[PDB]
């Protein structure tokens, strides 16, 4: 909005940007009545009394070809008074700062949802740079033409008289509070805005001109950053050599920085990870077979890079970032920093594969920072509230004590700041290792919501072994088929009252989470399958799997890589495998039981813990959510 003060003493000169509201003040400097006459290019909506509440608004149809090429003449008059004119010389210009605010096709507010508005900005956190180590957004150069594919286009369209920028100048700027989070390049690329440059005078010729910019974000939404970046163009009147520049017009574009998003087990797999180059090759054969069946790329981290760290699940989580112009996978690199420390940075980050990390990197970390403790539900609607990308799930204690663990707060805060998968804390700290993947998994299903929640279940396994005993198999041996292990009979397992007490307490820990998941994910019992599973309490009364933890499985669409439990063999078959098959095969799932005993199981993890998976991003666009 602008209010131009017109005067009979002096003619006034003014610029009018198309799309702006221009009013006249006729009264303040008048000498009883007035009339207005203007050139055809000016539409004056409002003969009239010289009264202060008379709203006179000027509208201009097109950009001026010359400065002052439109005129307004206000003739004041009275009963005995010959007319007195005031002159206003107008120059109209077009100043449009443009971005993809409809989110398909290149107010000043970023709004969520399908009817919303606001452009998207990607954190430029991959490495298209040929033989480099850094993320692309770390320097202030565009070093590759394909890097620009990651960036957001913004264009300044101007239409002015040929001499307009003799006396006016345009400046592009970003608030100092946001300059550290964005970098803007001008294309014909050189930086115009960025971490030490909050403003830049644009060099723009008169007439019609179009100037393209490319914008990269430098930081993910976080505690300290809601995720919005505003870029502003200001038109400055520099007509007076003995006076400071005066702002004539400002316009803005607001971008939202795209969140980091995880993919549930119900998303189709694209690539499997194992770092199974260590001591054993038959585990690796099985997962390789499964990957083939599932049509996945397969990548393996060798012993020389492993440093004997076999837990491919724990050091990273492969998510993605998504904009209308570009979607790419992005590895969240856990601070756990064991043998696999370098793998995400050296082997997973690369062209069109982004990187993020959080938390302290040389200590101050726990087991619950391992990303076996970081999972995500399938899409879910909870008491009317839709969660179309699911809800992040991570394990905690039920209350903080001297002996309890949590995922580091920096990680927790980063996940919640990616508002999109509204995290839910579960209770995993009762486990020795402490990971949600030790008691839950999700698998696809053809009916009802499209998945099942699988939970480890001591109840189910006691039921199974009791039925087997009732049918005369009390002598059948748990751990049949194992070289070096105490074989144990079903009857002695059942009669062990301390084992029963242990598993009763575990059942209680899992049941707490069952009801938590039910509330927070809106699940019914019909969404849930119990997988027969025994545990034992050991050091600090922390729970460990009694036999291979079958819930800690690899889910490759309908192909499942389930730890081989080595259960009692009844009518030629392990009754545990048999039970699991009877539960999952009716869903169309194919269960492969993988020997992981002396390589994973014995070192406190199973198939899921020794592998990782990159999965297809959701088709649903995160910005269409209303978090």
């Amino acid at each position: 909005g602008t209010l131009i003060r017109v005067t009979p003493e002096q003619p006034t000169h003014a610029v009018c940007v198309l799309g702006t509201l221009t009013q006249l003040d006729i009264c303040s400097s008048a000498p009883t009545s007035f009339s207005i006459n203007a050139s055809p290019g000016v539409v004056v909506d409002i003969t009239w009394p010289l009264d202060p509440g008379v709203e006179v608004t000027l509208t201009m149809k097109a950009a001026s070809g010359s400065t002052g090429d439109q005129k307004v003449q206000i003739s004041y008059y009275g009963p005995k008074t010959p007319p007195v004119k005031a002159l206003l010389y107008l120059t109209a210009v077009e100043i449009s700062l443009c971005a993809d605010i409809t989110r398909t096709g290149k107010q000043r507010t970023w709004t969520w949802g399908p009817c919303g508005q606001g452009a998207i900005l990607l954190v430029n956190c991959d490495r298209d740079n040929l033989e480099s180590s850094a993320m692309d957004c770390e320097d202030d150069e565009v070093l590759d033409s394909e890097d620009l594919q990651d960036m957001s286009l913004m264009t300044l369209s101007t239409k002015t008289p040929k001499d307009f920028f003799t006396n006016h100048t345009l400046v592009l700027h970003v608030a100092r509070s946001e300059m550290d989070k964005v970098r803007v390049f001008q294309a014909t690329c050189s930086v115009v805005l960025g971490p030490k440059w909050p403003s830049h005078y644009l060099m723009v010729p008169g007439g019609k001109h179009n100037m393209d910019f490319y914008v990269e974000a430098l930081a993910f939404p976080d505690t300290d950053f809601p995720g919005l970046i505003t870029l502003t163009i200001s038109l400055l009147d520099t007509s007076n050599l003995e006076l400071p520049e005066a702002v004539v017009f400002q316009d803005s574009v607001v971008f939202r920085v795209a969140p980091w998003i995880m993919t549930p087990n119900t998303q189709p797999p694209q690539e499997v990870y194992a770092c199974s180059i260590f001591e054993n090759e038959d585990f690796l054969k099985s997962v390789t077979t499964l990957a083939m069946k599932a049509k996945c790329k397969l990548t393996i981290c060798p012993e020389e890079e492993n440093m004997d760290d076999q837990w491919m699940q724990d050091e990273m989580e492969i998510g993605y970032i998504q904009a209308p112009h570009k979607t790419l996978p992005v590895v969240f690199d856990s601070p756990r920093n064991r043998g696999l420390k370098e793998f995400p940075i050296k082997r997973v980050m690369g062209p069109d594969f982004g990187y993020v990390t959080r938390g302290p990197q040389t200590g101050g970390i726990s087991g619950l920072d391992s990303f076996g403790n970081l999972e995500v539900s399938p899409p879910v609607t909870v008491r009317g509230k839709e969660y179309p990308l699911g809800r992040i799930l991570f394990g905690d204690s039920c209350y903080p004590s001297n002996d309890s663990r949590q995922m580091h707060q920096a990680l927790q805060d980063f996940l919640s700041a990616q508002q999109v998968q509204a995290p839910v804390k579960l209770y995993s700290d009762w486990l020795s290792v402490g990971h949600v993947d030790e008691f839950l998994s999700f698998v696809p299903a053809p009916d009802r919501k499209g998945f099942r929640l699988l939970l480890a279940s001591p109840r189910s396994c006691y039921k199974l072994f009791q039925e087997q005993q009732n049918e005369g198999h009390g002598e059948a041996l748990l751990f049949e088929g194992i070289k070096k292990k105490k074989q144990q009979k079903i009857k002695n397992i059942l009669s062990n009252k301390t084992l029963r007490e242990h598993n009763s307490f575990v059942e209680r820990c899992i049941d707490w989470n069952r009801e938590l998941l039910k509330r927070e994910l809106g699940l019914a019992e019909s969404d849930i399958i119990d997988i027969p599973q025994l545990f034992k309490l050991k050091e600090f009364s922390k729970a460990e799997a009694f036999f291979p933890n079958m819930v800690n499985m690899l889910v490759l669409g309908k192909h499942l890589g389930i730890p081989k439990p080595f259960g009692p063999v009844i009518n030629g078959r392990c009754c545990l495998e048999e039970k699991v098959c009877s539960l999952l095969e009716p869903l169309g799932l194919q269960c492969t039981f993988i020997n992981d005993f002396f390589t994973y199981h014995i070192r406190h993890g199973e198939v899921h813990a020794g592998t990782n998976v990159r999965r297809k991003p959701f088709s649903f666009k995160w910005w269409n959510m209303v978090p």
Partner: peptide
């Protein structure tokens, strides 16, 4: 290489 430490 225990999963825990």
């Amino acid at each position: 290489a225990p999963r825990k430490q």
